[PDB]
Amino acid sequence: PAFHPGELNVYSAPGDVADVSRALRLTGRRVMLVPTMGALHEGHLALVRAAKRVPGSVVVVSIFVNPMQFLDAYPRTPDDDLAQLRAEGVEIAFTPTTAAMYPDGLRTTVQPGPLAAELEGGPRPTHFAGVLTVVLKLLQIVRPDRVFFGEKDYQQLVLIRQLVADFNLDVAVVGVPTVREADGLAMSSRNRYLDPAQRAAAVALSAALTAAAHAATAGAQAALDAARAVLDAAPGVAVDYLELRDIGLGNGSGRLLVAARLGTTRLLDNIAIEIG
Amino acid sequence: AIPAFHPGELNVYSAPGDVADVSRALRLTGRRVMLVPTMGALHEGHLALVRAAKRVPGSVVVVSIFVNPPDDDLAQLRAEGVEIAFTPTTAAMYPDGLRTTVQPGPLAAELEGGPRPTHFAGVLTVVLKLLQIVRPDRVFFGEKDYQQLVLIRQLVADFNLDVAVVGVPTVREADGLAMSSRNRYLDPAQRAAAVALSAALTAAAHAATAGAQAALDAARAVLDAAPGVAVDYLELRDIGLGPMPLNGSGRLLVAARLGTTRLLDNIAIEIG
């Protein structure tokens, strides 16, 4: 497969991107991987820009809607995605087919640890097995020096660090802070599914979290009650969970995580919390 | 700084990071890294794996010795001209206990997975780890554990691992008995009866010109002629351990208990 530096090169075949990545590493370029499900927004572009700033980097952005972590409802805009990558000066997009990634269906897979059964995994007990299986595959195909994930999906980031540690993967996991709208709303491809009213109410998630982070000088109870009060004051926000955990998602430094529904649209957000 | 490596000597590393660093450094110097996973207690069967790895031009041979949850073994490797032994502790391999693991496909529940339903999840997890630590160009496994070999091929294909899996033919005693450290536990009567596994398989392989049923019936007759041999299974499958096709290549696998000693063997079969 051909590779043209300073241009966007799109490969669909795992063998092609593997070959190009290997070649590029051999010539001294450091391979950065940004796994995505497409429908790219500024949150994804922050990942790309973090990748870019690593000197000598070549940036691979994968776009794959992984059926195993689910599907028909997921936003798909491939045209726009590659345009954005071109604008960002990304040199490699990897856009594999389902058949190329899963020629044998679900055969060997990744079994995450107990964290996958909790929070996002509570009602979706196979979700993270899906995510970790695909991320492992992407990591083996691309063999990046570093792989970039958003903090917005904090439990996912934690589990990917677990995958990496547990399987001795020779990749550094880089967590990138959540990119937010002007009012604080965490950027998400799911935000498009909010009407004007729901969009207005949705600010309560980030407002609750930031209120909690500042309340936290008064202790964990204060922080949680501050967040709960903001969410309770929000018209038509239905809370699935609001949980304060250790940073590894098992007191002093923690992470406060929220998941809520606005209509049918389920939103997530989380924030660093320092107690005292 | 990259850990010390002395060419032509047995270099022993216990730290995963150390062997990772040396393997990476060596491959950059134009060596091809060969991995031979073992559980120690080495015999000629394991040496055959080592010798296969050694004959690859440019090879550096990494033999791991690890029991999934010594000086004699090292002497044998030294004598084989192996340059790297990797001897990690359980704590070094599992610093966070069992957390993320590999879930094999359904083949792992069959055959050997009958009595041991989680056995292969353990093997694939540790093999995946060793692969990621050492990043070998090729990894060597004996055909004696054929189902394990097939499952490792599935692991490598399924997770897109960039390693060649090399199956090495089973090394046998003079009478055909597959070499295994367990053979030592057999008393004379049991050791004599144990020959029936290999004899049954080789009979089947030659009977196979007359078809699959002839091959199975020949093997069963041989096993039926042996006292104190409790057959756990005797199965003819295709080479990937799916159902046997009407003709073509297959594999015949047997497992049996002699007292408390469980023995396995298997053989290539060509049907008709």
Ligand SMILES: Nc1ncnc2c1ncn2[C@@H]1O[C@H](CSSCc2cccc([N+](=O)[O-])c2)[C@@H](O)[C@H]1O
């Ligand atoms: N507002 C935001 N700010 C920062 N990062 C954000 C973000 N919104 C999303 N992201 C970040 O953009 C990425 C979204 S997809 S990457 C995870 C994944 C899961 C399953 C399958 C596959 N896959 O097939 O490659 C990949 C996440 O890293 C998210 O945390």
Ligand SMILES: Nc1ncnc2c1ncn2[C@@H]1O[C@H](CSSCc2cccc([N+](=O)[O-])c2)[C@@H](O)[C@H]1O
């Ligand atoms: N007679 C024989 N002939 C050829 N190969 C033989 C053999 N006897 C044994 N072997 C071969 O010697 C190797 C034995 S150990 S490698 C598999 C394993 C299992 C569990 C845990 C771990 N682990 O913690 O790294 C590794 C196999 O490749 C076997 O097929």
